[model samples]
Target: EDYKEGICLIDFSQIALSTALVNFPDKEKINLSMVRHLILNSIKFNVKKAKTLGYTKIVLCIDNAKSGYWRRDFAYYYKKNRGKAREESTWDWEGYFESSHKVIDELKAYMPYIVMDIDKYEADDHIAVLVKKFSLEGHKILIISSDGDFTQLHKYPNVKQWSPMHKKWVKIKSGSAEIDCMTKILKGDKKDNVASVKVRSDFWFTRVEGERTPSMKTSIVEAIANDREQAKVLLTESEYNRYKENLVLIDFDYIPDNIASNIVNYYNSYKLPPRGKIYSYFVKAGLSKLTNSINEF
Candidate 1:
């Protein structure tokens, strides 16, 4: 079947960070310019791939975590342990932020697509709303990212996801997004340290809030999921409360609703930079090599 139109939604924050960590070798001496070159190529590569998949438009979603994510406000432990990796790794995160934000600004100025970031909302929120709006308008929506947060969005018709990290289209059992989301809510995300229902939610109150947690993270969740028929009795009252809280923390409809209206209203707020500006931007940015065959993007 031919699509009336195709639109690609990119989680730019994910793409920017993962592109560097995944595509570039660490052992080699690296420079900011080299990282930028690789990142822009990643963007170009994915954008071109979307075209091959029949997408005709692009909307890039960025994260604005400065004031803090609302999800954190709702759940204190949401992604609370992610900082350990940065602290333990030798990666120069300070410079990565400096260079990546600069690159994002250049795209915001000259790239012919929506480059959007809203206060307290991550790119996932933007992508969720964008999927809602565009799909309702009958346009095909393709999500490009290297993360699993998007699995829930597949519940919506006319939407698909591709993980550039894995270089394949995401495949989940059909009509199973609800199940996926529920599983996520119950089992939690190890990467984010979102604790499972089996773990006590009040564990944070007694312990040093920032101390790394051990045990009861996964097997309990799996045990409960495996014993689905007895889940109601298996879950305690406090765990049920945690489940409700996690729902708000992970569910797009509830989480992204605060500014969902704004995402739509602001859709046309920025004018698309003229196509003529692309070459000049490339030249001035000393990315002139990107200009050749740039139209293919």
Candidate 2:
């Protein structure tokens, strides 16, 4: 059987957010022009890097902020803590949104490359669906994101995750991806406000210093089951039910097939936009260097 090769999945939200932070200072007024440069440069750098590594296809996935249906529905507090703007945060939401939209809109001229911005779903979900799809199709998948949640895709032989922030590829032990997800479930992600189990006296259990839990001692499958049973023992029926619900919230396997299919079709027929058009877009964005750098990218 002949297999397709060289496809890269980029999480646009992660890149945009990182770009905004890298170029802006805390408490400083947002600069849309600088943010635009950083966003385009980030994309151009990654795209060129992938091509240099022999990847011929690139799928850019951006988040739909109004989405996150499962997480929000499963837990009322899901990301509720994130609504408040931090005084010390460097990035401005409005500037980020505007610059990201500009980049995505201009990139659309390079059609069939598949910029996935699905409603009710995030860039993470989009990337996960494509990772599974591409892996099953025997295509090498390079995932670009600093978010460790994507480590699950490392279970596939042809998939690799790269963190731009760390400037290195993420390493995952064979057969440990499931264990990683289970650990995430148990620990709960404060950044996303996903609470798996209450940390109260009756339901909470924390290992002391130098203590090893079942998760640390057993196989990934065994450890997950053991943790589930232990939760049953500690939590009330309602609390346990909520824990299970939170598991669904954290899981990324629920992407709709239609959305995945649309992206896949687009990728199969990808074509680069005209060099002149790309240059005009970059020039308008005040990216003089990038205006002459599209061919290189």
Candidate 3:
């Protein structure tokens, strides 16, 4: 839907918590808390930034996928670590998911629109669709996210990408530097379990310092041909396969026609909170004057 201006928050609580635990098993107990805090701070920061910038609406995109594969709590992946607590910290992934869901649900009362993935899609997909719809309608969008996957959606004159980790804004476009970075990531981002490019597997090769032309396929081939032995060893075939599989599922071209039409017709009907809701959340999370400052803005 179109708005005078708006901020889109793409939530990934499950992914963030899951990754945090996977990377820091020793600090597993703090994973949930850490993720929650990060998300809260992110929301707070965005709300403040948008308010100061005179944006009138804020929308949050959340996952409503029914598939068990999306739920780390019900899966075997985190089952072994269940109920194990180190004081206030505990490895309760399910509990964390439920709690985070509740927090997001509560936010709906205050934000402009709280859209969910009704077709059981990831939050990023929903956001991708929403971004195009809003951008087409001439609404400014501040995409607040932690994942680089959303970078692809950061094009359009009205769209701006803000990574919580980077705490900076970057322009996004099809052939932009952000896209090139994502292409490289698509080839292989080992930390996220994404596979590497087969040709560039073993080689110490030049990478895209910024956006490159053609496509990843061409760039990777050049890297491989430039140094076959290095490419062979540097790239892991299995990882690339996984990357390919994941990429297929990520449809950046997705745009929901129905939602766009509905938004166009019923844009004004969307309810927006008076900014008190965000402040209350911060207070509840023990952020004291933090949210108050945002409200003032």
Ranking by lDDT: 1, 2, 3
Model 2 Cα lDDT, one tens digit per residue, 42-129: 7777887778777877788887665545446545566665665443455466666666666666677743356776455578777777
List the candidate 1 regions with Cα displacement exceeding 4 Å. Answer: 1-4, 22-32, 172-175, 202-236
lDDT, residue 156, model 1: 70
Task: Write down the lDDT that model 3 would get.
Answer: 0.51
TM-score of each: 0.81, 0.76, 0.53
Each prediction's whole-model lDDT (CA): 0.72, 0.65, 0.51
Best by TM-score: 1
Model 1, span 4-115: residue lDDT tens? 6788898778777776776656545446686668767877887888888888788888887656677877776666666656777666665676676777777777778788
List of clashing residue pairs for candidate 2: none
lDDT for each residue of candidate 3 in 172-231, tens digit (9 for 90 to 100): 664554434445444544333333444333222333456332235655544543443434
lDDT of 1 at 132: 79
